[PDB]
Design a protein around this nucleic acid. Sequence first.
RNA 1: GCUG
DNA 2: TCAGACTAGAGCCGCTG
DNA 3: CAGCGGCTCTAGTCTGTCCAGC
Lengths: 50, 146, 116, 209, 107, 714, 290
Amino acid sequence: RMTVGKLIELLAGKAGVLDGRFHYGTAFGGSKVKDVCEDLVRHGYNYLGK
Amino acid sequence: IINIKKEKRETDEETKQILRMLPKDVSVAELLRELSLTKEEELLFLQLPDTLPGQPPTQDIAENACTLADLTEGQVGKLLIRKSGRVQLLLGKVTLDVTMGTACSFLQELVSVGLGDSRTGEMTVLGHVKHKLVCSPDFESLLDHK
Amino acid sequence: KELSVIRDHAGSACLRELDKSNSPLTMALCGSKGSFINISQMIACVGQQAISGSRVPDGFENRSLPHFEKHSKLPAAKGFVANSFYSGLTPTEFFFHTMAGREGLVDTAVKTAETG
Amino acid sequence: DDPVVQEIDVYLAKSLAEKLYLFQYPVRPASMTYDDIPHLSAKIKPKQQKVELEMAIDTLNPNYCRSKGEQIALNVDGACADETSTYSSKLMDKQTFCSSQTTSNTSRYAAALYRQGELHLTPLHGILQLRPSFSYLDKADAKHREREASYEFLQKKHAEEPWVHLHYYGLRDSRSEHERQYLLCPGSSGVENTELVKSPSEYLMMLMP
Amino acid sequence: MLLFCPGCGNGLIVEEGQRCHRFACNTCPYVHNITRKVTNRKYPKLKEVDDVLGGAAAWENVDSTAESCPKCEHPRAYFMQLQTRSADEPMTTFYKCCNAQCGHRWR
Amino acid sequence: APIPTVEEKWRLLPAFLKVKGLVKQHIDSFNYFINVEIKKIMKANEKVTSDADPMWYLKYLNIYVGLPDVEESFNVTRPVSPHECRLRDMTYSAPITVDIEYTRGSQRIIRNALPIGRMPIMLRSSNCVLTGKTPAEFAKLNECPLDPGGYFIVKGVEKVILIQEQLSKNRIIVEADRKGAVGASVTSSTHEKKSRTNMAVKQGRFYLRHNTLSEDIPIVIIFKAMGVESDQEIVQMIGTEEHVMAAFGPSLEECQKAQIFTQMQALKYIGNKVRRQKTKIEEARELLASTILTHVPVKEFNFRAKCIYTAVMVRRVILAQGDNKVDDRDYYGNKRLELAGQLLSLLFEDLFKKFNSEMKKIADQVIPKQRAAQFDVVKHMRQDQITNGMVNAISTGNWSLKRFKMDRQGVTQVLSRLSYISALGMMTRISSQFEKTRKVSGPRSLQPSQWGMLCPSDTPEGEACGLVKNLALMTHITTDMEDGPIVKLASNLGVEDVNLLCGEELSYPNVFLVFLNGNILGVIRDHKKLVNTFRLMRRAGYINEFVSISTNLTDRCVYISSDGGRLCRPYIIVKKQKPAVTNKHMEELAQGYRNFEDFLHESLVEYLDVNEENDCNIALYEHTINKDTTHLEIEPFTLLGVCAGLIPYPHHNQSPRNTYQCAMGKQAMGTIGYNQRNRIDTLMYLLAYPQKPMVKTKTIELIEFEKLPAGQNA
Amino acid sequence: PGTQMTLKTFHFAGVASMNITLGVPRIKEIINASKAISTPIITAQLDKDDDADYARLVKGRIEKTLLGEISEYIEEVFLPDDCFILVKLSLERIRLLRLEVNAETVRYSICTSKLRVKPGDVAVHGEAVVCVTPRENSKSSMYYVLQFLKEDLPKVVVQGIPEVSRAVIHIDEQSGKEKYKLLVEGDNLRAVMATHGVKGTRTTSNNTYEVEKTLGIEAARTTIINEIQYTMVNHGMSIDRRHVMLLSDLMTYKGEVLGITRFGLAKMKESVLMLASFEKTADHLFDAAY
RNA sequence: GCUG
DNA sequence: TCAGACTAGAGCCGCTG
DNA sequence: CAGCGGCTCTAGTCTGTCCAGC
Ligand SMILES: [Zn+2]
Ligand SMILES: [Zn+2]
């Protein structure tokens, strides 16, 4: 089904709950993977959520 | 067979199908041909805007339309030909633009009709009309100024 | 052909470097779900979007959308999506993917009434 | 872009402003002119302007099939009556032209007699299209039909206006070279106009209320 | 060709008179004697195309080669992909394989 | 160097949704009905006169629609709120009050407020009690500030008039017949008559067809009946190229076989073909003046302006055989959208005419029979014709108006309350015209013309696929303009009256026609100066901003459209590679110094239309701006609509997945509103502990979904 | 399988041209047994298949060419003594396209079904020119019928088969050989079986009605088998041959190819209640009463 | 109208 | 909405006597 | 010189368009 957006929503949300943010998922924009990967490692989780 | 009553081939500029054996002009070129190349007088026929920039003089009105029937004889304006073929009709403080109208190729006759008597009168043909001019307001300049 | 050749070349490269244990690769190899097209389409390059077996027909006068010049027969003007689903589709590319996709719903609906 | 050529003065003439008509012939090319053709009558109604003309066509020229001309004249007119008759002779002598009116108002149209260095405008009272009439064929059918055997109100309103008859003076006749001078206006070379003093912003508000 | 009467502007027809063929009006006496050769060439379009077709290069100007089919595994191939049925949430492909001219066509 | 960016440009979208969009499309049609169109209906029907016993007459002076009221048992009346109507199962309606002038022997007796019926008042319109309230005062009315309105309450059920998609009347379609011939047609709907007329080439010769003719008739006879008698002037209009003449040739050769050489003979021919509903001449002459091509005006039985139009049709059929440029009905410039107010206008005109004719019947019975007393019609003004005509049509959804041969069904639906999005979603739906007749797969496809107007993804999955569609977030539907200054401007921009010329000019390459709503305004040379100047006059506010102008260079016409029902969308104006909108302007808008209307006036933003963005070149982003760009897209996420705006990262998903969420997201359990506990409904689902989404669009913030969310983070 | 056929594209019968119906509309066309279908295609094998010069000759014997396609002009001539329409043949283009036509043959292409034109009225004054002297139609027409012929005379067929819209050459790609087969998009199988230089024993047709009319019921029976199996294999379905065999035997056991329509079922099935429980439920019950 |  | 393969008619021309 | 007759052609018309749930 190639629902890659579900895979990003899980990652952006996880980086969001850990620092009190709502990450945006707007079409043709939104918060990028490169930004949320660095939020997870700052809080001690793996950058790809595994 | 009569050479002046041949049958009409359909494009009126191209009437001659049987014989004894165009590009488009621009208003700068039309006025240049009738001044330098040929001194002969010619009847133009021009379409002015619905209102000219005047007031009807003492005509008892309301900001109603102004037409050439309301004005008085004399000089009414000046016609300027500029470089690059632009032509303007300066008809007051305002300048109106002048462009060539549709190129008619059917016959047009300019005629007087005078009912000099109750039931009879004179009809007189003053000449043929070949070219049409269109005058329009320059809405870009009129508006840009204000 | 040139575009489709670029798509084929970009797909082989991704598979070569994908490590064993990549879950998507496993499901393609064992055939349980997906295919090497699907992997290549979400990693490397979404294909030419095709409607009724052809490039996107002109739905305006001599062009597909007002964002392209008239008579232009370039790849992106007629439905070539150079992005993958990871990189995200551009406004223009998304519209093309949706259009080719919508031919999906249209065909399924037509078949049901007749096949019955 | 300076006005490097032909600053042309533009004058206004009113002496013909209630007299001048533009006639035009949609089916006759600009090279075939009615200047040679003898005209036999001119008719007008001065209000609800509807001009009619009758033009004579000759019969000794080769382009006239006299055998067919005798037949069509015999269809239209009873063979020997001649009290009322479209054609006096046994042949079709005349073509009649019937006008259609182009526009109700003509206020914005002007004829422009160009002369070297100056232009002379004159208002038009009317613009008419003249077409060859096929009514004679209908009359021939009506004579045959009798032998064999709202538009109503509006036409009766146009019948109230009495016909005005006009003498026709063609382009060759000296009266045409005479009256052509009344398209000019006597005036000084340089006059500042009392009218047309409005500004661009007053003019824009006048044409766009 | 259309030719029209200088008098009334109806359409002329060709007929025959006592000395010549004539263009003649149907509604007025006007006739025009054909004194000399007059012509009108339509100039239609020839069926030039010869068009041979179906060459192998005209078949394999599509992307795919050196892939694997589930039937005969040969490299010289001709692939196809569809998606236009959204009842099929899986993808749709069809393949042609013609190195040994085996000619499979499956899903 | 890169082209610089104005990052606050997205703010133009909240400033836009304050006035247009967000279910305003519905409200701004109903307001236009009850504040102006109800007066035009009365104005066209202002007098009634009994045929028997003349010189006695009833006159309508003015009409009012009033405020919602309930009529109770002992004739007490009190104002009512929308929620009391939901509970008690009654209709939320305001009394139509009219003032009349009439004869009781004294020839001017007046009444200043006669109630003749009751009008359903759509919520959040200009007469609803909710409009202009504060959220603390919605609480007294038991209403929710977020509830969109745009719907009626009729007998206690919430009913939405859906947006109907239509074809544009008064436009020359050129299309292929079943048999592969090419023809043309123009559905000539006017307010007095709708009719279709066709141009057929059934044997290589052109015939005109109409339902009032028992057989279709050669077009050269119709030209002759309209008084262009010479064959030359006909061919001059049709065209003077050799192949156009060769194609029209066999049609002259038909009329010359019959004895049709004269107008009277041609009118006699048409007379002997007319189906009977003076004989031969006037049942033809009136038919050409009034029913064939009825949208083209003939003033005093001058047919010149109709001859030019029927020549344009024949020429387009000829040039569509040589190459098969048949037109597509699927282009949205051709499509038109009919909203709540334009349907109710037809229904009320039918009801008001049946009211006057019923009252005329009453007068005709009693005046030459009953009594010497000069009876007053006031005693016969039974209200039930108006009230029950409105309420039955809205409740049942069938609009059988025999006056205009219309028999639509399924016009209204019950507003869905499965969730907040299910209600707001329904308010943007666009039902189509075909209505699932058969599997066509032609209009079900996503046409590129839908860009920014209709949502790509939000369509049902099922038999309705591609026939039910939803508006995008940033679209506007025009109303009908006054039409006056467009003509007065165009006649000054060098247009020439088509009556002053023969046919031949229409076949010149340097001559373009100008059309306004399908009625030719004349011809022009230098169309580029016309189109540019007309756009300048629009930008500076002299011409109304919704008037679109565009060029078709293939068929040599300039079109000016001022009719209502066409989708507009705002764009930023770009001149010489620089966008007009600036960061300072966006900052001023945020401060409130300037508003979206101010941007339109200063020529910073203008509304393009689907026929006009055919001409324009639109950059998506500032870095895509090239030498020949005319407009810049404000926010490209507004290509998606309301329901698709819930999806996080939809551009990372395969397209069918987005469509399914647009169905599922209407069905999710959630919270209907703040009044949900004081609300009694047939079936209501609520989630006990709802949470707002951890990842959200900007669209979620615009529609305020995170105030009453539907879901939980798992 | 009809529900699995997604109405795919990318199918052109191997010739980058000659589009075909496939999928559900092709199965529907076969089982309806309609006498005409969309794009009927005759495959003609050439006997002297060695080289292209022989293919283009016999292609030109089946593919239609009109008189206007080989004439460099057609002209009306009006003279004082007579008037006629004249056609000059472009004998250079004849000599290249390898057609067996000249002025004397074009006299035989005309005189058939063309307003009763007399043989005398057509003359062959040189090897490149023909003249058609017009005559009064004497039925709903005027002698000025030259304007009919001036648009009609080019569209007369001088050579080939009238039902064939086009033909194309196809080339194999196997390494072992190279031979040219001829694909005919048209609907006269008998004529293509009988032109000199087509191997008539090995040409076939899509259309079961053409094969029945030309080759009998047993060749039509095999064509139903071949065509259903061809359509199934292209969409990657597979059916055991015994099912398509039984379907074809069912449609041909009464000697005529009967459809699976209501009309074919009324010729196969005797039972009133079977017939009345499918379609036309009123008419079958009143007929059984009568 | 929507689900199947 | 879109064929669709039946059922009469209108002829048509040309041998068929 | 005239009359059947079948052809041939318009076109006319009635006949379908998945299963089921709520
Ligand atoms: Zn004539
Ligand atoms: Zn294979």
